[PDB]
Amino acid sequence: AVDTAEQVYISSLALLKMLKHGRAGVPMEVMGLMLGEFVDDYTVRVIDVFAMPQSGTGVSVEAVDPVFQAKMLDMLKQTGRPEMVVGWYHSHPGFGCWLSGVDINTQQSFEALSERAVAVVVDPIQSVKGKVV
Amino acid sequence: RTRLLDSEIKIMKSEVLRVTHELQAMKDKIKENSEKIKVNKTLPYLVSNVIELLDVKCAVIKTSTRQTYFLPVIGLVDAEKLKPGDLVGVNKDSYLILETLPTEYDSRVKAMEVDERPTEQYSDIGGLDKQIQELVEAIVLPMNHKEKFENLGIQPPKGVLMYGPPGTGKTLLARACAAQTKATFLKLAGPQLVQMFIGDGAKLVRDAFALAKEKAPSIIFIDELDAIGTKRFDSEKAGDREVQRTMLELLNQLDGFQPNTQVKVIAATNRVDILDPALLRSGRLDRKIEFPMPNEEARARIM
Amino acid sequence: KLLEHKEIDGRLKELREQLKELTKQYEKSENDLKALQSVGQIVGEVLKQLTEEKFIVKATNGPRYVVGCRRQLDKSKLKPGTRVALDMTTLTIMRYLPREVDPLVYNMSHEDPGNVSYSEIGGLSEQIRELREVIELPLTNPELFQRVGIIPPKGCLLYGPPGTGKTLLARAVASQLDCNFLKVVSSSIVDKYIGESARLIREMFNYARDHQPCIIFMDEIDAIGGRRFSEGTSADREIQRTLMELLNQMDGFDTLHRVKMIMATNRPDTLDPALLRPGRLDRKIHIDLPNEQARLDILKIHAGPITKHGEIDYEAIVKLSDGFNGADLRNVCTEAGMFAIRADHDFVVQEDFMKAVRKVADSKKLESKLDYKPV
Amino acid sequence: CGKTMLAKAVAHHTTAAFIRVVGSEFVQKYLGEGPRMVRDVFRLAKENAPAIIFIDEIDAIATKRFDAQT
Ligand SMILES: Nc1ncnc2c1ncn2[C@@H]1O[C@H](COP(=O)(O)OP(=O)(O)OP(O)(O)=S)[C@@H](O)[C@H]1O
């Protein structure tokens, strides 16, 4: 569609939270939310990552508990930095990391809240030392 | 003036709950039926067999492609209706149990069913009236008046054999009782139980008996039983085996272990001395019925 | 005038009970709606452990693989021979499982119909006693055998003329102990495949290993037994390999325990001499035709629930009976009732019996060479 | 005539690695797994030690008449 320059910033804690939580629950796609700040049109700056709790024992299924939202963001308000949610993540642990049908399913419902809330995919398997990915 | 208006408005306060129950019926019914439309309209159902049933409510599946599958979630069937070895309809991609299929029956067994319903009344056979009496009083009355036996209280007889010279007529009574008795009359040619692949004649015999059992008034006719009935022998270097395996399957599924009361067997050979004694013994084929040549008047009757 | 309380509460009560019975449908079907998203998982066995995370399994339908585990699996539970549940796509381990049962086993484990006690059969009481001490004692009390210091026998062989009551005796035993009677018909084992019958034998004997006091019964061995060949038809190869599976796993290296094996057939002449060695089949137990006292016994068994009148010369019926089976006398009783159904005699007269004996002994003009003593 | 009784004693008194083999175990459902099992036994045999293989009842295997159709 109408595009802009494509640029995503990071935090250094983010990548570590991504790999740890995507490794500890590896054979099932583990939901996690992503937290940061929309600075402008074309750069997005994630600064914080908290993982989502799990549920029933099935691949790729995802949920956003709003009381978890309220209580987690409340704790981050009494923590030094409260900021705006910027998207979410999960893994595609055995493959070349494309968003699945459930992924685009939660994306068309999640896109009505934020425009450039970017979906991110960590993979703790196809990276060894010289890949993030 | 206070209570009746309170109840008439409490009919609306409970109509809030009635519209809530109508919502929980209809609107949730829309979503649940939408999902089961999205699953069940996938019309190819891979059929399979339930291998066992774990409980740590967990079923194990071998499909027809012979791939063993586990599932922790059973699906849209109930654990009462399941037993190890059942055909169920399974989604291809999800590998989820959808329906419950009736039986594992061969197309040849279905082809063995008698549906033409021939016509040959007992007046068409002349000169064999005593054997007709013995056959009818042996077979047709266990199909009709069972209480008459158990008032005397013994047993119904187990199967009737015809034998004799080859032109006295043994196909005639079979087509006759087909024309008269309205049970599931079931034909079976002799060498149809002979198979090439090792171990299918036993399956064929057992499927024949199973389709007889599930159509309970069941009259099974065998013609030229000596095709599979052969006197066994211990030799070396050579010997027919698999036909005796089918014969032993016929014996054991007929008589011995796990007896039955819903089967009726009619056999007819041209020669007698071929058979193993276990085929006849005295409770596999109960009433030995000889056929003589037509004496004098019977030939005139036939002509 | 205050019937408004019960009216409004009847509205609330019908709404509550119908809300329970109409939202429990929504509850169970919403559980189904959530459950529609589960994924089938591959069944396989673990060959061995490579590293702390690398595991090497074998899919049962085909190829081998190299997989990983979860993080909560207690990887010391993975041993060579276990059975696991593999992911469809990630292809990692989800769950360790107990061994499967191969439902052919289930159709002869619990399917077994019981019968009347051992007083139903008769006239061969010594063999009944003998089979009882060889079977019932060494699982109820083997230490008496241990005091002598000799291992009890493993398997027992029945043989005799057709229908002298072998299978019925096994049914009486299967009504007596009621522990683990795996009764194999020995004919629907072989199916159409290569190693299928061997795999069935493996499953049966491992199930015998699990549920330690087991009884194996194989009627009509002569399907699976054979003797030996110069390799005539290609189908006989698989039967001989199946029989060698039996011969191996009845002797082997891992010796059996408590698995008593009852074996019955018509003619043991056609049996394989490798099966007739003692130790695999210890005692050849003979069941012969009944004697005069024994024919009297079986006749007074089957004539139990038969409405008769007291002029019954049982001596004449047994005296005219010669070389009969138990089913011969059962057929005598049946056809005596048949003659009673003739001319509508609701009782059974003694004249029925002599005619029925004459019919039955008339019909046995056909079967000779009834003796086949083994070896 | 005491055939396996001596292999039992040899398995007892030895120090070497000893692998028992069921004769009909090689012929299985999936295709080609038989020769692969032969490879498996012999690779492990080459691996372990000065070792001993006992294969019971090779009459399941060595049959001098075939039929290359079935
Ligand atoms: N009352 C009768 N007695 C004898 N034969 C008759 C009679 N009525 C008709 N038939 C003839 O009998 C023929 C049937 O003979 P078959 O059934 O071929 O002999 P069979 O009893 O079948 O012996 P098979 O062929 O070994 S089973 C029919 O075609 C009729 O023409």
Ligand SMILES: Nc1ncnc2c1ncn2[C@@H]1O[C@H](COP(=O)(O)OP(=O)(O)OP(O)(O)=S)[C@@H](O)[C@H]1O
């Ligand atoms: N001693 C007996 N007491 C009572 N009924 C008996 C006796 N012996 C045989 N029968 C009857 O004969 C049949 C039992 O025979 P089985 O135990 O089945 O022997 P079998 O299975 O025929 O073995 P075969 O003939 O070698 S295949 C049943 O109809 C019994 O009622």
Ligand SMILES: Nc1ncnc2c1ncn2[C@@H]1O[C@H](COP(=O)(O)OP(=O)(O)OP(O)(O)=S)[C@@H](O)[C@H]1O
């Ligand atoms: N010195 C011995 N001579 C004979 N039998 C013995 C001897 N020592 C023990 N036995 C017992 O008799 C059995 C001999 O048979 P096996 O060793 O099993 O030979 P085999 O395996 O039966 O050969 P088969 O029948 O061709 S497979 C032993 O297993 C013991 O139960």
Ligand SMILES: [Zn+2]
């Ligand atoms: Zn995904």
